[PDB]
Amino acid sequence: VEKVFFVTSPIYYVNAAPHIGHVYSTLITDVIGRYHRVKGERVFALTGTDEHGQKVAEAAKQKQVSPYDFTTAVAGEFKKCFEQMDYSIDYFIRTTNEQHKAVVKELWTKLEQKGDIYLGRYEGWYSISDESFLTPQNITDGVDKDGNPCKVSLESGHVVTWVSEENYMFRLSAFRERLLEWYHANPGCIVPEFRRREVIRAVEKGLPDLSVSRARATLHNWAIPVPGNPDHCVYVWLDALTNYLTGSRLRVDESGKEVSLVDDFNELERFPADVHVIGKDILKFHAIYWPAFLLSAGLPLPKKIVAHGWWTKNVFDPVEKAEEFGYDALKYFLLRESGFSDDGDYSDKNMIARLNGELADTLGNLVMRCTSAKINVNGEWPSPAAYTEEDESLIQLIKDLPGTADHYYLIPDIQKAIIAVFDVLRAINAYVTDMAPWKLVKTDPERLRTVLYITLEGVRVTTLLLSPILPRKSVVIFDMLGVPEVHRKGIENFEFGAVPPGTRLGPAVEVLFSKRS
């Protein structure tokens, strides 16, 4: 099925300002989207804001503004932050959007017509901050903001309260077997693998039914009303998860405003998501509830959910650090430092070590070497003479790299993709050191042509595969190398030899990444 590659971030609660968590999740979404564009595919990358619910209305109340003004202001802050971070997200969705509300109503009605929503009761614990129902085994003793004794969540440490309400209930318990079939038939559907095992164990234990409405007073009336029952409001998570469906059905103009909601998702060829990017805190909502809703509605299930090691929901301001160290460099660092865990060093010390060691010394040094007037005297891509075995060993690494990096990007595992590209960059550097092309200008011009050609081509291929990570710097490198625009994307240009000998380098001025103390 040739379709639009559909990648999403979570939609973030607007109770507080954009921080590194949100920026990280959206960065991952962006990188995946960029890689598929570089590959030549149609892409739709989605991000946005989750604006309804008790938690947002209470944050608005604290600031003494109306929820409408509060959500609009904070959404504006998220939008500004993502523009400054230089993402290439196709659409920014807000759950206050009238087209989103219509989709929530259609989905609700569909679930109700199937017999999967009934009127019942929830009596149990609830975390307002997580918008999450909890069994007594997921709570323990703790303290509130003040310090008085209370119950808290085992998941997040936030305060829990006992709720007793008549609620519309989704028959989640009826979907246990089908969810387990789905996990087993699609063993790459949740990444990384240990998070997939966690989900399976949880569903094997048994699933209760899920409350999907609340009484309107509890939510301070700041929510989507239930169709045909205005005393109730739709659970912020059914509302929130539905953004992915809404997003898949919006025609978007050249400036990013939604202009139209289509009736059938197949018309735009996005649904279901190829990758849902999430933090580990919302795994259950995405890997249990969401597919159960989709199964109930007869809608297709997402292909992959990737859950990263950070939380989604001592200051670290990403825009400040990016102004200090560079935007591409910060993005590189966030993606290189952590895989699917928290155990990872985010200090100025480590940022500088990676900036200096990998970006400046490995990549940047190598870009300057192969384009300098001292070594590349004609300022062009030379024609290679015959290859030695050592030449062939490096060429083989360069040729294998696109296949290797591609598999990593598709897992997705961006850290391993970066590591694989840099392994090849290190090998190119070792080769340049062995061949001493600076000596070869005088001693053996015929040999230098071969060495310089291989070096230029290794730099091109590595840079192409790093272009989703370093989108601006990749453009600078390609300009220095004189790579025509047509050769800067497309799977055809993953092949060794795509830029012919005779191609002129770009003009010189001059640093790519400047080292720090």
Ligand code: MET
């Ligand atoms: C459908 S994704 C919703 C994510 C949620 N608003 C959060 O901040 O965790």
